[PDB]
Design a protein around this ligand. Structure first.
Ligand SMILES: Nc1ncnc2c1ncn2[C@@H]1O[C@H](COP(=O)(O)OP(=O)(O)O)[C@@H](O)[C@H]1O
Ligand SMILES: [Mg+2]
Lengths: 407, 58, 42, 765
């Protein structure tokens, strides 16, 4: 195709995309190498009824550490409030504290994964279940996490785009070749059902891009024009608000807050109230499904009002610059944009709930393998990073040529 | 009732969002299917290659 | 207010670690989100 | 090593200086002629380096008696290599500028030399044009007083001296000529720059804006400022002193709508009125008189807080200088549409080769490599700097700080050596004056409101027994002199009121004393109650560890806190470097668009067969018109070709000159070929009665007025779009990327509108 040919004729951009493909090669050979424990054959023979590697935890502690620091910017903390107030070196100090917090958080959660393996099965235990080889496993898992985030730091500077998001893309789409190898190993519904499934996948990708790439343009007008000097100028200044501002963070919240009550269900008592609360807090069946939907909606509202907070934005438009036509730049603009976010994050909430409940209500009506992942996080991450990378790359060909009036 | 006129408010505000057009929609769909197919066949080729290489090194 | 967000962040990190003792439904991931000049006339 | 290369070239120049003696003025002009003919006969400038610098060295000896040291020779080689030769104050920077100017002037193009003001331009032009016109090279000179014929004679000479402002205004007025014989500058070859740290770093985003045809209306300015003189502080407007961000509150907004008699202030109808209210309110709340400007004879003159000096020629932007002139009852120069605009970094970016000496370029060396790809060579001095640059005595309580400032200058003045202290603002100079008058010490105060006696005070301020208080802590052209007694004492003593956020101003203050190997002592009596320690406030630890060991805040000569405040300077300057590195790549968009359309306007005014390019513009306009009214994907025979033939009959052809069936049902390529053949026939029919002269004058005035008007509109619209692109981050997009894409879309729409205007006006004469 001629777009890939246009990137083929530009040596610097094709050097950067070859750099990204080689860093994904580094990511792959980091995934294929085994762990120092001996239970790799055990998890191969069992199947635990996801996989396990040195990159098994992934960036998930760095995501939740970024969410922890962006929640403790809301309170009265003079330290982090002043680091956020400081423009550049407060941001770097904040990011380095976030790196320290995610490496200690991954270090304790790898120990938690070892303890959960011991409480799960007696085959995936180690020869010293209480003697500290778990610290060595935690150090090598956090070393893998540090290697992949340093890989992301390399590929966000020398490579194409958002370095964390490209390797998360790479990890999340690396299982669909196993799924498409499994689909005809289980197939033998002959084809009509498979073309209907492919049509529904293309239709839900059209739905997710039509919801995701949709902005609400509030036209802000800086006062710094002399209207008696020139004819009318800028319509090109506005405030873009998304339909779904939150992202996948509410879906990850609902995963966290519906897998946390199964620890209380992993009490040693295993009582009848334990089996009943485990039967109510599971979302493959409606009693957990409605809790999952309502908790997604609640935390979409919460994380919208965290990251696109109307009071901080209304103060940033009051201090340096200008206003919205008809609306005073104080608290009236904050009330106006709070109304706007009330009307947008409802649709973003319903969207995340619908797309996060598609896999359960999809594998039922298409009884084809239960490990297949389309929908929810599995769909939004791949589609958002995939088209954001091309929207980053196609902004160079417009830089390349200025075709004047003489030609 | 707050619910009915609030629903009217939401359905009137959603007609002011800058939705993608049909041609940019199908451009985005084509490029996202191209990227997902390109990276899944790149990952299948590297699966086969690294599997043969770890067969070689045993 | 402020201690409400403190409690939400602490309970979030807490139940994140609690679900992260197992995380048996994993494979999901996450993407975070004065002026002078020299003027001259004619 | 570059310094080994410089010293071996200096030794070669000294050996061939031993070769060169007792010739004639006729022999040296013959040397000039033979170096020019050797450059004509295949040889390059680097080959003739040693002989040319020997000729300039001996000629400077003959003319002015002063003989260049090898330090000046290695600095001249480092200036000829295209990069910057940093060398300290008092070492002859103009007579090390005189060497690569002569070497790059023998080629025959136009060498420029940049100073900071017309007085230093005239001084250097006289005392170096003696040396240059000892050898036959005609040296011009440039002012804003000269007319275009005198300026064309100046640039048409071999070597021109001027300021940076006049070079910039001559470039932007050569890009608005109507004929190639009106423009004054040659192709831009070379420029050494005096004080590169001020001309390419501090003044590196200052717009040389050429305005035109003012609006001629004082009415809204005087109404807005007469209204805002009736407001009360913290009841009608917030004001925070750390960042001048004066802004109305809702009762102030309501009484503004009351007094101006309007329904809503924050509407689209009252944008200019809202602008004039905010600028008058910023003018007489934020801008205090003798700390932010100074009134002179009929005009406001800007003072800043970075440097203590005041800028003569500047104006404030966005309509604030008019609000200051309206709050002081003066007469106002009105506002206009800008016709052109360049900065100092773009102007000196688009030369061919440039260089220039300075005093302080290390932090700005790691700046300069990113922008002008020039190194900074630290030139080793002639005589070693023997003055004492002692570490700074730091302690809290600014009253006690000023007390030991007064005690220090008192115990200096008991011995009798002069002391030049360095203040930042006017009020700290006032407090030092009130202390030193109460100590019985006579002195002289030199500020932004006592600036008429600057030459005499800086003349007699180095002599024995004279205390002076200077506000400009970086002295560019002002030179202290000292003879008897002061050399027998410890030279001029320097006292720093504070330590700046930039080390360059501090080093410029330190470099006033140790000139040409003379004694000196400097101090920076620094506080903890100042803005630098407020920005770098780790208050509790340092405050307690210097608080338990105190006696009325006794001074602490602390090397660890000296390195800590050096690290504080490095943090502030890293932040400044990152800010300039962001704003540069925001500026490169309009830089590239301006270079493209200035090159194409010079192609319009330079070439002689322009029927081809006007035919191409009419072809592109006509092709876009038929592509608009013929949908590319839709089937034919619904394409509203009646509207298309109406558009052609009202734009290109006459009213009844194009019919219905002759383009009916055919393809767009052949129908645009038919319509372009018909406009070529109409074009020759229109041409044939004034075929050669008046067709070309009419063509050129239509094309140039269309380019000028659409470029004025595009400057305005890119300004507004760069104002409003920072709000794009509230949808996680990249603001730089959306700026780079929408500036390109707007520039292509601009070129489409240029071609439409040129086509319409040349086809409807
Ligand atoms: N080789 C030399 N021999 C004698 N005097 C010199 C020599 N070089 C420079 N000077 C004198 O030193 C003075 C330095 O003034 P200036 O060059 O303006 O200072 P700066 O180099 O700090 O700009 C000049 O007036 C000049 O006459
Ligand atoms: Mg000088």
């Amino acid at each position: 195709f001629r777009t890939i040919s246009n990137f083929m004729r530009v040596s610097d951009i094709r050097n950067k995309i070859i750099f990204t493909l080689l860093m994904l090669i580094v990511f792959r050979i980091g995934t294929f190498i085994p762990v120092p424990s001996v239970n790799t054959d055990v998890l191969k023979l069992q199947d635990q009824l996801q996989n396990f590697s040195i990159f098994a935890m992934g960036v998930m502690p760095y995501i939740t550490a970024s969410i922890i620091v962006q929640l403790l910017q809301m309170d009265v903390v003079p330290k982090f409030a002043e680091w956020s107030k400081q423009g550049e070196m407060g941001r770097r100090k904040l990011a380095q504290f976030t790196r320290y917090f995610t490496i200690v958080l991954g270090f304790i959660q790898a120990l938690g994964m070892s303890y959960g393996f011991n409480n799960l099965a007696g085959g995936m235990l180690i020869q010293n279940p209480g003697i500290g080889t778990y610290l060595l496993i935690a150090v090598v898992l956090t070393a893998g996490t540090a290697f992949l985030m340093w890989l992301g730091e390399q590929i966000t500077a020398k490579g194409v785009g958002n370095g964390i998001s490209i390797i998360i893309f790479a990890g999340i789409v690396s299982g669909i070749p196993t799924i498409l190898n499994q689909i005809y190993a289980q197939q033998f519904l002959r084809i009509v059902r498979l073309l209907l499934v492919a049509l529904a996948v293309v239709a839900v990708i059209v739905g997710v891009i039509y919801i995701q790439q949709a902005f609400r343009k509030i036209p802000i007008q800086y006062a710094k024009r002399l209207e008696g000097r020139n004819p009318v100028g800028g319509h090109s200044t506005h405030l873009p608000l998304k339909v779904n501002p939150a992202g996948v963070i509410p879906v990850i919240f609902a995963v966290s807050f519906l897998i946390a009550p199964p620890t209380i269900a992993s009490f040693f008592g295993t009582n009848d109230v334990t089996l009943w609360i485990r039967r109510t807090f599971d979302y493959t069946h409606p009693v957990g499904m409605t809790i999952y939907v309502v908790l997604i909606i609640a935390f979409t509202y919460f994380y919208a009002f965290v990251q696109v907070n109307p009071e901080q934005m209304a103060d940033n438009l009051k201090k340096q610059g200008g206003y919205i036509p008809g609306i005073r730049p104080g608290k009236n603009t904050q009330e106006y944009v709070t109304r706007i976010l009330y009307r947008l994050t409802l649709v973003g909430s319903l969207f995340l709930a619908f797309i996060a409940v598609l896999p359960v209500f999809f594998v039922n009506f298409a009884n084809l393998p239960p490990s297949a992942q389309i929908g929810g996080t599995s769909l939004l991450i791949v589609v958002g990073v995939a088209l954001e990378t091309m929207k980053q790359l196609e902004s160079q060909l417009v830089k390349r040529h200025y075709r004047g009036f003489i030609k | 009732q707050r619910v009915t006129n609030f629903f009217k408010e939401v359905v009137r505000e959603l007609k002011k969002v800058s939705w993608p057009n049909r041609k940019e929609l199908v451009n985005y769909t084509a490029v996202v299917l191209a990227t997902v197919a390109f990276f899944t066949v790149f990952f299948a080729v590297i699966d086969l290659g690294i599997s043969q290489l770890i067969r070689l090194v045993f | 207010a402020k201690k409400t967000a403190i409690a939400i962040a602490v309970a979030l990190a807490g139940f994140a670690t609690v679900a992260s003792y197992a995380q048996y439904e994993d494979g999901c991931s996450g993407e975070l989100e004065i002026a002078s000049g020299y003027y001259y006339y004619s | 090593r570059t310094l080994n290369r410089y010293e071996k070239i200096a030794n070669d120049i000294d050996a061939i200086r031993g070769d060169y003696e007792n010739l004639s003025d006729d022999a040296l002009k013959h040397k000039t002629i033979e170096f020019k003919e050797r450059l004509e006969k295949g040889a390059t400038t680097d080959d003739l380096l040693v002989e040319a610098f020997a000729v300039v060295r001996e000629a400077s000896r003959r003319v002015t008696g002063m003989f260049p040291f090898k330090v000046q020779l290695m600095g001249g080689v480092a200036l000829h290599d295209g990069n910057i030769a940093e060398m300290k104050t008092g070492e002859g920077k103009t007579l090390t500028s005189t060497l690569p100017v002569y070497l790059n002037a023998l080629t025959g193009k136009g060498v420029h030399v940049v100073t900071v003001n017309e007085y230093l331009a005239s001084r250097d032009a006289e005392q170096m044009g003696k040396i240059f016109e000892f050898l036959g090279l005609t040296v011009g000179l440039n002012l804003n007083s000269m007319s275009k014929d005198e300026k064309r004679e100046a640039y048409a000479a071999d070597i021109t001296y001027s300021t940076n402002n006049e070079l910039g205004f001559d470039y932007l007025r050569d890009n608005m000529v109507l004929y190639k014989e009106q423009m004054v500058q040659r192709p831009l070859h070379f420029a050494v720059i005096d004080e590169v740290d001020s001309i390419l770093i501090d003044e590196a985003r200052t717009p040389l804006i050429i305005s035109g045809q003012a609006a001629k209306s004082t009415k809204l300015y005087v109404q807005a400022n007469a209204f805002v003189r009736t407001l009360k502080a913290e009841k009608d407007y917030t004001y925070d002193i750390k960042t001048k961000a004066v802004q109305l509150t809702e009762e102030g907004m309501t009484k503004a709508e009351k007094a101006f008699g309007i329904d809503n202030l924050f509407d689209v109808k009252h944008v200019a009125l809202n602008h004039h209210i905010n600028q008058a309110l910023k003018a007489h709340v934020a801008m205090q008189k003798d700390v932010d400007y100074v009134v002179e004879d009929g005009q406001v003159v800007i003072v800043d807080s970075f440097t203590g000096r005041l800028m003569k020629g500047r104006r404030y932007s966005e309509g604030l200088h008019q609000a200051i002139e309206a709050k002081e009852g003066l007469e106002i120069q009105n506002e206009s549409m800008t016709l052109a605009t360049i900065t100092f970094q773009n102007y000196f970016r688009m030369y061919e080769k440039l260089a220039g000496m300075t005093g302080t370029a290390k932090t700005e060396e790691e700046e300069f490599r990113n922008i002008y790809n020039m190194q900074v060579v630290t030139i080793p001095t002639n005589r070693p700097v023997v003055r004492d640059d002692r570490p700074d005595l730091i302690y809290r309580t600014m009253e006690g700080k000023f007390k030991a400032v007064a005690e220090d200058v008192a115990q200096r003045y008991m011995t009798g050596q002069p002391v030049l202290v360095g203040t930042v603002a006017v009020e700290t100079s006032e407090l030092i004056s009130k202390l030193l008058k109460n100590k019985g010490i006579p002195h002289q105060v030199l500020n932004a409101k006592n600036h008429e006696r600057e030459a005499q005070i800086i003349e007699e301020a180095g002599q024995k027994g004279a205390v002076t208080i200077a506000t400009n802590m970086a002295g560019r052209g002002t030179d202290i002199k000292l003879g008897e007694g002061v050399k027998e004492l410890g030279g001029l003593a320097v006292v720093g009121t504070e330590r700046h956020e930039s080390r360059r101003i501090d080093n410029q203050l330190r470099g006033r004393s140790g000139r040409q190997g003379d004694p000196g002592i400097t101090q920076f009596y620094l506080s903890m109650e100042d803005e630098l320690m407020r920005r770098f406030g780790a208050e509790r630890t340092m405050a307690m560890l210097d608080r338990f060991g105190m006696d009325d805040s006794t001074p602490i000569q602390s090397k660890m806190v000296s390195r800590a405040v050096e690290s504080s300077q490095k943090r502030v300057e890293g932040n400044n470097f990152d800010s300039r590195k962001q704003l540069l790549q925001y500026d490169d968009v309009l830089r590239q668009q301006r270079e493209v359309i200035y090159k194409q306007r010079f192609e319009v005014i330079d070439s002689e067969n322009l029927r081809e390019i006007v035919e191409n513009m009419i072809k592109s306009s006509l092709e876009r018109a038929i592509a608009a009214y013929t949908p590319r994907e839709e089937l034919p025979e619904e394409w509203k070709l009646d509207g298309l033939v109406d558009l052609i009959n009202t734009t290109y052809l006459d009213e009844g000159a194009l019919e219905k069936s002759d383009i009916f049902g055919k393809e767009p390529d052949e129908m645009l070929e038919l319509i372009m053949d018909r406009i070529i026939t109409k074009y020759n029919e229109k041409e044939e009665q004034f075929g050669k002269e008046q067709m070309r004058e009419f063509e050129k005035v239509i094309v140039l007025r269309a380019v000028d008007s659409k470029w004025m509109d595009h400057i305005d619209a890119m300004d507004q779009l760069r104002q409003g692109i920072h709000l794009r981050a509230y949808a996680q997009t990249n603001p730089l990327r959306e700026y780079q894409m929408e500036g390109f879309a707007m520039f292509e729409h601009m070129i489409e509108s240029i071609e439409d205007e040129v086509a319409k006006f040349v086809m409807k004469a």
